[PDB]
Every structure is written in C-alpha cells, then in structure tokens.
Amino acid sequence: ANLAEVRSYCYLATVSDLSTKAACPTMGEAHNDKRADPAFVCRQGVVDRG
Amino acid sequence: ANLAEVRSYCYLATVSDLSTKAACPTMGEAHNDKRADPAFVCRQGVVDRG
Amino acid sequence: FNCLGMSNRDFLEGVSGATWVDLVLEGDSCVTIMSKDKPTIDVKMMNMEAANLAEVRSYCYLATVSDLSTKAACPTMGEAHNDKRADPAFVCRQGVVDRGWGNGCGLFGKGSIDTCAKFACSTKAIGRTILKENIKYEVAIFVHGPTTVESHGNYSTQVGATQAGRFSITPAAPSYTLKLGEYGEVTVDCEPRSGIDTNAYYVMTVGTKTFLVHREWFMDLNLPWSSAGSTVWRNRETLMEFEEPHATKQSVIALGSQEGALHQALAGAIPVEFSSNTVKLTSGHLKCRVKMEKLQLKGTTYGVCSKAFKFLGTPADTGHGTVVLELQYTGTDGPCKVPISSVASLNDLTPVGRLVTVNPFVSVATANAKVLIELEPPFGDSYIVVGRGEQQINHHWHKS
C-alpha cells in the first residue's frame, strides 16, 4: 500500500507489408528506402539472375 | 577506356555529441531517444549508485 | 574523497588491538578502515602529479617527400655523387640503370645513379621518461561521523563538519598528522615508494591520446626518430622510392602513413591522461601506515535516542556486502545515539550485523533530522532495526 515494468516480449501479427529493392549483378548492394525508419525490418540477400 | 566501388573503410572524426539516458536501480533498462535514428551509436552499461 | 559509492573500495580492520594499520592506496581506489571503539575512516588517494618530465625519443609520421634529385653517371664513368649529399637537406641512395646510346650514353651497360629526397617531420609521436623529487601525492581522509545521503559526498560540508581533509605527501615529508577536531587526529606515514609499476615504462605520446609503453617496444620500433634535436636519423622510412628509374626522375613516393602500426599496439600499453607537463598516475601506488591511536570517538556521553525512527526508503546494495540507508528522526530531543542494529530474527537479544557507520547519532537537536547509515548485514535473511519495543521499526534483508 506500486510496481514497475521491466521488459515486454511479444507474440505477433503485422508481417503484411512487403518490399524488395533489387540490384543487378556488379551494380553493388541494394538499399531499400524502408530502411530510414523502423517502419520495417530489412535484410539483404542475393539472387542468381541475368 | 569503367570501374565500380565495392566497400569503404573509414578513419574518423565525429565523436563529439554525447548522451547518457539514466535509469535507477530496479527501474529497468535505459532507452536513449538517440536510438531512433543512426544519428548516434548507443551502448548500454550499469553504474553502482543510490 | 570518501569511499561510499566507489567500485574500488576495500574494508579493513587493521589488527587485533591495533591502533595503527598498514595499507596500500592506488589511483581510483578507496579504503574504509574500522577499529574497535573508534570512528571509521576512509583513506583515499586523490591525485598523482609531477610538480618535471623530460623527452627521450620522437618517432615521426611524415610529409616532405617533395623535392627530387638524380645525379647521373654513364657506364664505366664510375659512381654518381649528388651535391645534395653535403647536408641532410635530402636523403640519398645509389642505384644503377641499364643504358647507352638509346639515352645519350656512349657505351652500353650499367650506369651509376645517386638520387636524393628531402626530410623534415610532421606528426612527432613524442615520448618521455619518469624519474622516480617532483612527485607529490594527494591523499584525502574522511571520517564516518554523522551524515545524510546529501552531505555524505559534499567535500565542503564535511570539511566544515571537520569530518574530512585533503593533504599532500611528498618524498620530502612522507607523513602528516591530519587533525579532525574532537575526533582527535589521524597520522599517515605513506611511503612514496611505489611500483606500483617501476619507472621502467616509457611515456608514449600520440597526438592527443597519451599512453604508457614498454621501454623496448618503443625504443626498439621501426620509424624515423629524433632525440632532443631538429636533426632526424633513420629517415629511411621515406621508402618505396627505388622504382629503379631512369636518370631523369626517380619516383620518390611518400610512404603511406598508416596509424594502424601504432593503434594496433594499443591495448598493450596502458592509457594515461597527460597535460603538456603532467602525468597523473592512477600509474602508481603508495604503501601507508595509518597510525591512529590519536583517532577518537565523539558524542559518547550522550543518551540513546528515544523517539520514533522512520526509514526513508529501501536500503541499497553497495555491491560490497554492505547496504546503505537513510533514517529520519521524529525525535524532538537533541544529539542522541541512534539505536540501530542488525538482528537475525525479530526480537533477538544479540546483534549480528556490524555497522560500518559505527556509533551513529542524530547530529542536531532540530527534530526530523536525517541519518545516513552503512552496515554489513549477515548472509541470508536478517532484519535491520531501529529503536526498541513498540517504538522500534524494522526492515528485512537477505544477503547472498
């Protein structure tokens, strides 16, 4: 006769919006505009093409 | 008689601005607002106090 | 200037029936000392300064690799002597070039060559020495007399209360007798001796970040250098010149300056703050003997506080096996002893927790005064208690 939070693990939803910034071979890496704000989570990879 | 960049290692300057988001014992972790944008590089630690 | 809150703290109980204690102080560390029937105190080394260093060497990272020269000599005409060999104005080095008719010479074969480049320095990675009479120490002594969370760290207040002091120690006079009013006095005999780390280490200076390096790693390194003169030797680091050229021009590429060579050997040498003329030793230590048969209690002829006592918050862990906390006295009466102890279980008769803040007591007669207290409770659960009977309050605690 007053607790306080410390952490917060989630189980989640929003995995709806997508993005795929493409870069041709030897054209370097790809930078997705959705990298300016935590609006989205980005991750790079490479694709066999031509 | 057409090269392209690949990487770019730096030797650096800007290590001028500072920040220290404080959190009291049992009050959990500290979140610095300078964590929203790569404006700064943040790293957590703990200090003996009271 | 006192120990509370520092991570480099050590608690001591000199000896049995000892009026003195032998101790060791170092840079950012502090020490709390306890002694039967006597106030607790904190000896702490504040600063290490030279109030007179001297340079020893000076490795450079460089510029001037601009001017050129190429004294040519035809085959069988012997060697080539460049006039730029009279003064260290330039660094010369001979070589030979395959030639003949093709390029103005009469016979065919190897011709002499002796070119030269200039040399001056830019960024001097200077370094110096540290003689074991200019060394002065600054020791600060605190007295665990009455305090509050507030006043505990205020040097001012404390000095005012004659519960603190800051004196210096020198090889000239390695001791001192700090007087603390009615608390008598403490007399240290610190012995400037230290290793600590032996002067054996050099004083490395690099741009802004000073460091302490090993005589050899330093001295036995590969880079241009100069003692105390404008004259430089081993400037051979003006390398990668010998494109093994023509008599016309011998490319004298300035060797790329890679601060990595230095940086890489960072961790090895300890870092240290250094002002133009000073080197605060943290590297350094000091063996002292805290004689204190002249250290004495106070307010021992007062009666026990008899009025309610309230906690002002959950005690805190110092990280040293002791806890801190601050009381408030409802009491209207004046300077009385604070009845606080550590009990293993409610209403036990004999205490179990030793108080760091020995013989505590409400400093003023002004009711509702605050009292800071640091005490080491027993391991496992225990109870802190203040007052007795139905006045008595308590708060549980569990050490690990």
* Resolution of the structure in the document, Å: 13.7
Tokens 């708060």, located at residue: C395
Instruction: Give B35's DSSP letter.
Output: G
Is the four-CA dihedral C153, C154, C157, C160 of positive or negative sign?
positive
On whether any CB of chain B is under 8 Å from the CB of A5, the answer is yes
Instruction: Give the separation between CA C329 and CA C352, rounded to whole angstroms.
Output: 24
What 3 state SS string does chain C have? CCCCCCCCEEEEECCCCCCCCEEEEECCCEEEEEECCEEEEEEEEEEEEECCCEEEEEEEECCCCCCCCEEECCCCCCCCCCHHHCCCCEEEEEEEEEECHHHCCCCCEEEEEEEEEECCCCEEEEEEECCCCCEEEEEEEEECCCCCCCCCCCHHHHHHCCCEEEEEECCCCCCEEEECHHHEEEEECCECCCCCCCCCEEEEEECCEEEEEEHHHHHCCCCCECCCCCCCECHHHCCCCCCCCCCCCCCCCCCCCCCHHHHCCCCCCEECCEECCEECCCCCEEEEEEECCCECCCCCCCCECCCCEEECCCCEECCCCCEEEEEEECCCCCCCECCEEEECCCCCCCCCEEECCCCCECCCCCCCCEEEEEEECCEEEEEEEECCCCCCEEEEEEEC
Is the four-CA dihedral A31, A34, A38, A41 of positive or negative sign?
negative
Per the entry, the structure determination technique was cryo-EM
Residues in chain B within 8 Å Cβ distance of A4: 26-28
C37: left (phi over 0), alpha (psi -120 to 50) or beta: left
Chains that touch A (3 or more CB pairs under 8 A): B
Q: Is A28 in Cβ contact with B6 (below 8 Å)?
A: yes
Determine contact, residues C213/C229, Cβ cutoff 8 Å.
no
Determine contact, residues C57/C64, Cβ cutoff 8 Å.
no
Residues in chain C within 8 Å Cβ distance of B49: 5
Q: Tell me the β-bridge partners of C118.
A: C90
Nearest to B4 among A5, A7, A26 (CB): A26
| Burial class of C366 by CB neighbour count within 10 A (0 to 12, 13 to 18, 19+) | exposed
Spatial CA neighbour of A28 closest among A48, A46, A49, A50 = A46
Query: Distances in Å between the alpha carbon of A14 and those of A17, A18, A38?
Result: 8, 11, 13
Spatial CA neighbour of C210 closest among C126, C144, C143 = C126
Q: How many CB atoms lie within 10 A of CB C332?
A: 10
Instruction: Give the separation between CA C260 and CA B11, rounded to whole angstroms.
Output: 10
Instruction: Give the separation between CA A22 and CA A46, rounded to whole angstroms.
Output: 9
Instruction: Give the separation between CA C398 and CA C400, rounded to whole angstroms.
Output: 7
Query: Distances in Å between the alpha carbon of A12 and those of A7, A18, B22, C370?
Result: 16, 16, 30, 50
CA-nearest residue to B39 within chain A is: A36
Query: Distances in Å between the alpha carbon of C23 and those of C30, C43, C144, C189, C287?
Result: 11, 9, 18, 10, 6
Residues in chain B within 8 Å Cβ distance of C6: 48
Instruction: Give the separation between CA C164 and CA C179, rounded to whole angstroms.
Output: 9
Chains that touch C (3 or more CB pairs under 8 A): B
Query: Distances in Å between the alpha carbon of C312 and those of C43, C157, C327, C399?
Result: 29, 22, 6, 20
C207: left (phi over 0), alpha (psi -120 to 50) or beta: left
Q: Is B48 in Cβ contact with C7 (below 8 Å)?
A: yes
Work out how many CB contacts closer than 8 A connect A with B.
14
Q: Which of 254-283 (C) contact B at CB < 8 A?
A: 259
On whether any CB of chain A is under 8 Å from the CB of B3, the answer is no
Q: Which of 14-33 (A) contact B at CB < 8 A?
A: 26-28
Residues in chain B within 8 Å Cβ distance of A42: none
Shortest alpha-carbon distance between residue C316 and chain B (Å): 7
CA-nearest residue to A38 within chain B is: B36
Instruction: Give the separation between CA C203 and CA C126, rounded to whole angstroms.
Output: 8
